[PDB]
Amino acid sequence: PRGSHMIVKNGEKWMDRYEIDSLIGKGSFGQVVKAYDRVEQEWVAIKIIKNKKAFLNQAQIEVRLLELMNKHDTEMKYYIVHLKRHFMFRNHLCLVFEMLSYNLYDLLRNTNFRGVSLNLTRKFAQQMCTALLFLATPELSIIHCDLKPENILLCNPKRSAIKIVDFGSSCQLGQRIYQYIQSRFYRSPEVLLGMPYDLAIDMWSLGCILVEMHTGEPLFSGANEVDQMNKIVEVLGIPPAHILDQAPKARKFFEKLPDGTWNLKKYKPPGTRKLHNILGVETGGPGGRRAGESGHTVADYLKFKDLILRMLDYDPKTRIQPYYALQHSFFKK
Numbered sequence: 001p002r003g004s005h006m007i008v009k010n011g012e013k014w015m016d017r018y019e020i021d022s023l024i025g026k027g028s029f030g031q032v033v034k035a036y037d038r039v040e041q042e043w044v045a046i047k048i049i050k051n052k053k054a055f056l057n058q059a060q061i062e063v064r065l066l067e068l069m070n071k072h073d074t075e076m077k078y079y080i081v082h083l084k085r086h087f088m089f090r091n092h093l094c095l096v097f098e099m100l101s102y103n104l105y106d107l108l109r110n111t112n113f114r115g116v117s118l119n120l121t122r123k124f125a126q127q128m129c130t131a132l133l134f135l136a137t138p139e140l141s142i143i144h145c146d147l148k149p150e151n152i153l154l155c156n157p158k159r160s161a162i163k164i165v166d167f168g169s170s171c172q173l174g175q176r177i178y179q180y181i182q183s184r185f186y187r188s189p190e191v192l193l194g195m196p197y198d199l200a201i202d203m204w205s206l207g208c209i210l211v212e213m214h215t216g217e218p219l220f221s222g223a224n225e226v227d228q229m230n231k232i233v234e235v236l237g238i239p240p241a242h243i244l245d246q247a248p249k250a251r252k253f254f255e256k257l258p259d260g261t262w263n264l265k266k267y268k269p270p271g272t273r274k275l276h277n278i279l280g281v282e283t284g285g286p287g288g289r290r291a292g293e294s295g296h297t298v299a300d301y302l303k304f305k306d307l308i309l310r311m312l313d314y315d316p317k318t319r320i321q322p323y324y325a326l327q328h329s330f331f332k333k
């Protein structure tokens with residue numbers, strides 16, 4: 001056997017138990033196959049980790065975090081994909097999951113990137129904030145570290161229930177091992193700036209994800225780290241001095257002046273790309289496509305806009321935390 005991937009043959013049966021149906025996924029971690037578990041009589045998704053020591057080490061962390069989670073009593077743990085069991089087979093670690101449906105990016109593609117309704121956006125946001133409240137449980141303190149539409153799956157194609165997958169980049173608070181993390185579009189300023197991070201980076205990612213779900217377009221579509229930070233500054237302005245003063249990578253993006261103030265190195269002027277206009281609050285919503293529509297009033301959009309700007313706080317110490325996000329007027333019945 002050569003290369004890092006397992007040789008998968010559709011039709012084969014593993015350990016007189018799993019009937020392999022099809023290769024349904026391929027990522028940097030390895031592969032995902034659909035299999036029929038003859039013993040429990042159900043479809044499962046088997047995540048097959050590459051036989052490369054770095055990947056096996058990180059997948060053992062994923063297993064430990066998923067077993068810590070799936071054992072907590074609360075009904076909140078059901079927003080996290082269920083790890084059924086794991087086993088070694090042909091020198092690969094294999095993680096067995098419940099079979100889920102397609103991811104929120106596929107849902108955007110299905111709308112021809114016009115976005116989903118503010119009402120469906122709100123349902124996704126409530127479940128996501130509840131999942132993040134669960135991860136923030138003191139005995140867990142799990143940072144997902146790779147929230148993106150691709151890592152949020154529908155349970156069922158005809159329903160709005162979601163779960164979070166892929167804890168392959170995850171760590172617990174105080175066990176940071178990667179200086180470079182998060183998918184670029186959803187990467188928090190503290191990570192771009194090479195600072196130590198905490199659970200607040202997942203709330204940043206969530207703010208980005210919810211705007212994209214409603215507009216159909218990434219809020220911050222950087223081609224690279226410098227473009228990413230410049231796109232963030234277009235919307236939010238120059239980060240606070242107290243943060244840049246302790247940021248290892250401040251000078252990758254910004255320059256300190258005699259005055260002790262920071263500006264950009266070497267785009268719209270800072271803070272002039274208003275979320276007000278990105279969302280089309282007063283001009284019929286994204287691309288004007290929601291004009292008049294029920295559920296899409298200026299009052300609705302101003303509540304949504306307010307919660308997003310609390311999620312996109314530059315300061316990880318004052319960025320809105322999940323419990324408080326769930327108390328926001330955006331969610332009030």
Ligand SMILES: Cc1nc2ccc(-c3cc(N)nc(N)c3)nc2n1C[C@@H](C)Oc1ccccn1
Pocket residue numbers: 024025026027032045047081097098099100101102150151153165166167
């Ligand atoms: C349909 C389905 N049910 C699933 C159940 C579990 C998982 C899954 C995938 C990964 N990376 N990490 C965990 N912890 C669980 N993925 C499922 N998928 C999507 C697979 C096909 O692709 C995907 C989906 C997401 C990411 C990569 N590839």
